[PDB]
Design a protein around this ligand. Structure first.
Ligand SMILES: NS(=O)(=O)c1ccc2ccccc2c1
Ligand code: NA
Ligand SMILES: [Zn+2]
Length: 257
């Protein structure tokens, strides 16, 4: 009886195994655009993904992760609200059963169709597993997806999904360039929060871009054909793999713009 996204194991149950689920800095949150504070001290986000080395894509049973080589300073995030340098380890998405839901963060209660999380760890902690034990260990860049025009830079990911349909499947995924997933603007909101799946650790500086990317209906429909089950088990479509907004608990969300 492990956690996942249902009536009996979904987000409202997670606190029994991970009591930090009711903590002081949980994610996601609703971003109240009118109450977010413009902070002139915030710097442009520096996203330096030229040398990224995509290795593999994995169906982990909750989402799919596109993995990177994080054994050298290659793809790194810095600037923004960050001190120091954060290495890209993986990205994944959360999405809905319907276009009207799927994002984790919300904007004035608006839910997007999906949300991309580019996960980075602070190089001062030496690797990811140590970083998650620190309050400034991770920086997750969140990007909303809306359904409209296709995102051409997403298609390589969509087309490999049939090869990783079920939990535990992986496939080689080299030369994937995550720059093709970024909107034009890097304007952002930021706040201190947590992992949005167990273990829900309170180790994340969230950086949520204001500008969404457009993906096609056909692209998100392919997300929705993935499976949360493993091969040889009854089919459970991988949909609605998002945690609802959690209490802000008087954290301030700061705007770069
Ligand atoms: N969804 S999220 O907050 O970006 C996220 C990112 C990295 C994770 C690594 C392990 C467990 C949970 C994780 C959650
Ligand atoms: Na369409
Ligand atoms: Zn995530």
């Amino acid at each position: 009886h492990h956690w996942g996204y249902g009536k009996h194991n979904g987000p409202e149950h997670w606190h029994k195994d991970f009591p930090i689920a009711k903590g002081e800095r949980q994610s996601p949150v609703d971003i109240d655009t009118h109450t977010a504070k413009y902070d002139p001290s915030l710097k442009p986000l520096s996203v330096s993904y030229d040398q990224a080395t995509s290795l593999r894509i994995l169906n982990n049973g909750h989402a799919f992760n596109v993995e990177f080589d994080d054994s050298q300073d290659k793809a790194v995030l810095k600037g923004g609200p960050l001190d120091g340098t954060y290495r890209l380890i993986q990205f994944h998405f959360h999405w809905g059963s319907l276009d009207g839901q799927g994002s984790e963060h919300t904007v004035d209660k608006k839910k997007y169709a999906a949300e991309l999380h580019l996960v980075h760890w602070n190089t001062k902690y030496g690797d990811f597993g140590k970083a998650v034990q620190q309050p400034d260990g991770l920086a997750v860049l969140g990007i909303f997806l809306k359904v409209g025009s296709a995102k051409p830079g997403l298609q390589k990911v969509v087309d490999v999904l049939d090869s990783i349909k079920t939990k535990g499947k992986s496939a080689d995924f080299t030369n994937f360039d995550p720059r093709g997933l970024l909107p034009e603007s890097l304007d952002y909101w930021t706040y201190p929060g947590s992992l949005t799946t167990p273990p829900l650790l309170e180790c994340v500086t969230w950086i949520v871009l204001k500008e969404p990317i457009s993906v096609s209906s056909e692209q998100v429909l392919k997300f929705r054909k993935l499976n949360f089950n493993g091969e040889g088990e009854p089919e459970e479509l991988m949909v609605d793999n998002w945690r609802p907004a959690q209490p802000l608990k008087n954290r301030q969300i700061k705007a770069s713009f």
